[PDB]
Enzyme design. Sequence first.
Site, PDB file in Angstrom:
ATOM      1  N   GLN A  79     -21.371 -27.561 -35.080  1.00 54.48           N
ATOM      2  CA  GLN A  79     -21.686 -27.939 -33.707  1.00 54.48           C
ATOM      3  C   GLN A  79     -21.381 -29.397 -33.387  1.00 54.48           C
ATOM      4  OE1 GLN A  79     -25.407 -29.742 -32.826  1.00 54.48           O
ATOM      5  NE2 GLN A  79     -26.517 -28.091 -33.869  1.00 54.48           N
ATOM      6  N   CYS A 129     -27.784 -26.834 -30.532  1.00 56.66           N
ATOM      7  CA  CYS A 129     -28.275 -25.873 -31.515  1.00 56.66           C
ATOM      8  C   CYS A 129     -28.807 -24.618 -30.834  1.00 56.66           C
ATOM      9  CB  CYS A 129     -29.359 -26.511 -32.395  1.00 56.66           C
ATOM     10  SG  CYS A 129     -30.780 -27.296 -31.530  1.00 56.66           S
ATOM     11  N   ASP A 170     -34.328 -18.830 -24.689  1.00 61.82           N
ATOM     12  CA  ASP A 170     -34.752 -17.969 -23.592  1.00 61.82           C
ATOM     13  C   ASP A 170     -34.020 -18.329 -22.309  1.00 61.82           C
ATOM     14  OD1 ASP A 170     -38.292 -17.436 -24.454  1.00 61.82           O
ATOM     15  OD2 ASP A 170     -36.407 -16.943 -25.466  1.00 61.82           O
ATOM     16  N   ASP A 205     -38.943 -26.888 -37.614  1.00 63.97           N
ATOM     17  CA  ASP A 205     -39.087 -28.337 -37.697  1.00 63.97           C
ATOM     18  C   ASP A 205     -38.121 -28.837 -38.762  1.00 63.97           C
ATOM     19  OD1 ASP A 205     -39.805 -30.975 -37.872  1.00 63.97           O
ATOM     20  OD2 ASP A 205     -41.804 -30.597 -38.703  1.00 63.97           O
ATOM     21  N   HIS A 213     -35.479 -27.723 -33.819  1.00 64.28           N
ATOM     22  CA  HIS A 213     -34.166 -27.182 -34.151  1.00 64.28           C
ATOM     23  C   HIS A 213     -34.128 -25.673 -33.981  1.00 64.28           C
ATOM     24  CE1 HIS A 213     -30.187 -27.769 -35.735  1.00 64.28           C
ATOM     25  NE2 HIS A 213     -30.365 -26.833 -36.649  1.00 64.28           N
ATOM     26  N   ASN A 223     -27.610 -22.016 -40.220  1.00 61.76           N
ATOM     27  CA  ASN A 223     -27.478 -23.268 -39.495  1.00 61.76           C
ATOM     28  C   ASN A 223     -26.056 -23.415 -38.971  1.00 61.76           C
ATOM     29  OD1 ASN A 223     -28.166 -25.692 -38.364  1.00 61.76           O
ATOM     30  ND2 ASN A 223     -28.629 -26.741 -40.293  1.00 61.76           N
TER      31      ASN A 223
END
Length: 220
Positions: free
Chosen positions: A19, A25, A71, A137, A163, A187
């Site tokens: 990214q 993220c 969301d 976290d 994150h 990740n």
Amino acid sequence: APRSVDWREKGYVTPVKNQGQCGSCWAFSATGALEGQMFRKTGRLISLSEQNLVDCSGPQGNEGCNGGLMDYAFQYVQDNGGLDSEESYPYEATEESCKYNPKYSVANDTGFVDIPKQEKALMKAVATVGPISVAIDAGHESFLFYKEGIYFEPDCSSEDMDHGVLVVGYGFESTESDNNKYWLVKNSWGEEWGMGGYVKMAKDRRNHCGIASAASYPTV
Ligand SMILES: *[C@@](O)(C(=O)NCc1ccccc1)[C@H](C[C@@H]1CCCNC1=O)NC(=O)[C@H](CC1CCCCC1)NC(=O)c1cc2ccccc2o1
């Protein structure tokens, strides 16, 4: 529910992407989960554009490269009624004006479902539904150096996560029992980080790093 689950070996997850220097993220997490759901329905595995989300989800509340919810991404996809493919709207790691093209929409959703805040509900979801978008976290520097094994940060908040990531399954390490269970998490920091871009978060350790506290998945 089974004792071990891996959705990658079933065709629900795409290669690990990087990214770059942009707080997207949430984008990659939301896409990942929606790719899983689209594979669950159609059977096709297509890589979805994160830049579409970064640029075009303003009205829903996300702040481009300054953070955002998953969301809100799902809500944007539902209201816009589509999402372009990664190849049509590539990721350039910087916010821009919306360049959405309905001719290249390859995915849709009809809303989201938020998982309760216990790990049991999370497990049931990953077992029955598929890859799930969650948050952890990861502000501590120990997470920056992860390589292999289960990850355990003693000073991990169960309530303040910074994150967004994607749970693709879970399992155990077959050593002496207890504190051997883990969440398989994908990740978006590239293939050279951790286990080819993956991490094993603590599982059944009373919501370590709040992995089960901000969990959701889109409806298709
Ligand atoms: C995320 O971790 C990321 O995209 N990259 C990591 C990173 C951080 C800094 C530099 C480079 C790379 C982001 C990180 C934030 C964005 C950048 C600024 N500082 C950050 O910490 N994480 C998020 O965006 C989180 C995602 C989770 C958080 C908990 C559960 C929900 C989703 N979301 C936000 O930070 C966020 C969301 C919203 C919505 C409305 C207003 C503000 C806001 O902030």
